[PDB]
Design a protein around this ligand. Structure first.
Ligand SMILES: CN1CCN(CCCOc2ccc(-c3cccc(C#N)n3)cc2C(F)(F)F)CC1
Ligand SMILES: CN1CCN(CCCOc2ccc(-c3cccc(C=N)n3)cc2C(F)(F)F)CC1
Length: 217
């Protein structure tokens, strides 16, 4: 495997999104993973509708819209629904709404998804290198995560109990200190202009390898 990977260099990551006061992190994580697969399959980089997930991947999928949800059950909605709309046709409103999916605005499909084994950062590394960006949950319930500005993030009070959906778009090392490159959905001013580099091979730090998944078109 390569020592470092960055999927932004490969034209597979869209601009950073801003979830606002709506807990749609899981929707943004899910769409981000699919966006990479869509580029790999079709040649087009297109932001997909997180709002479509918030509004439509609801009770039947065990999701709670702006009060949280799962990337895995989001992918299964896209599979069952036979499509997801573009962000352009179904833009983000940071609120729970009635489902407004229309197949006339379909931008991607999903055929399957894969959930990686619990806590295996080596299996995660392999998937990031060979398959694409991987949706993950992290423990983001610490002020240090909010206040993060730069470098490799390490929080000694972090747990493996995950509560925030993000996307691993790469990995590497900062002067030997190994990290995962994570795309957040907290706007362009969070962390390193939307991104956080999180400690890698530090005992599943903040639960980053607790619940990884990726979709396929
Ligand atoms: C330590 N620095 C203070 C000034 N900061 C200036 C840039 C702004 O920093 C932030 C950006 C987003 C968030 C944030 C937190 C939860 C949800 C969402 C959503 N959606 N955005 C928080 C901060 C914040 F907590 F840090 F303010 C950077 C961090
Ligand atoms: C077992 C896996 C549990 O994982 C969880 C749990 C809670 C959440 C969650 C809940 C409310 C708001 C937000 C964000 N705005 N995220 C996300 C995930 C995750 F990681 F699936 F996204």
């Amino acid at each position: 495997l390569p020592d470092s990977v960055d999927w932004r260099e490969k034209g597979c990551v869209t601009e950073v999104k801003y979830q606002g006061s709506c807990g749609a992190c899981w929707a943004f994580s899910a769409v981000g993973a699919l966006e990479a697969q869509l580029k790999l399959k079709t040649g087009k980089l297109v932001s997909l509708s997180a709002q479509n997930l918030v509004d439509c991947s609801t009770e039947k999928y065990g999701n709670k819209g702006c009060n949280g949800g799962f990337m895995t059950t989001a992918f299964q909605y896209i599979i069952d629904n036979k499509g997801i709309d573009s962000d352009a046709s179904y833009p983000y409103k940071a609120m729970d709404q009635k489902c407004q999916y229309d197949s006339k605005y379909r931008a991607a499909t999903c055929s399957k998804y894969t959930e990686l084994p619990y806590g295996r950062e080596d299996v995660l590394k392999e998937a990031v290198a060979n398959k694409g960006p991987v949706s993950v949950g992290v423990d983001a319930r610490h002020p240090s995560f909010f206040l993060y500005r730069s470098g490799v993030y390490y929080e000694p009070s972090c747990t493996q109990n995950v509560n925030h959906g993000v996307l691993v778009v790469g990995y590497g090392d900062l002067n030997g200190k190994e990290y995962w490159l994570v795309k957040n959905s907290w706007g362009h001013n969070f962390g390193e202009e939307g991104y956080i580099r999180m400690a890698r091979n530090k005992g599943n730090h903040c639960g980053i390898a607790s619940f990884p998944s990726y979709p396929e078109i």
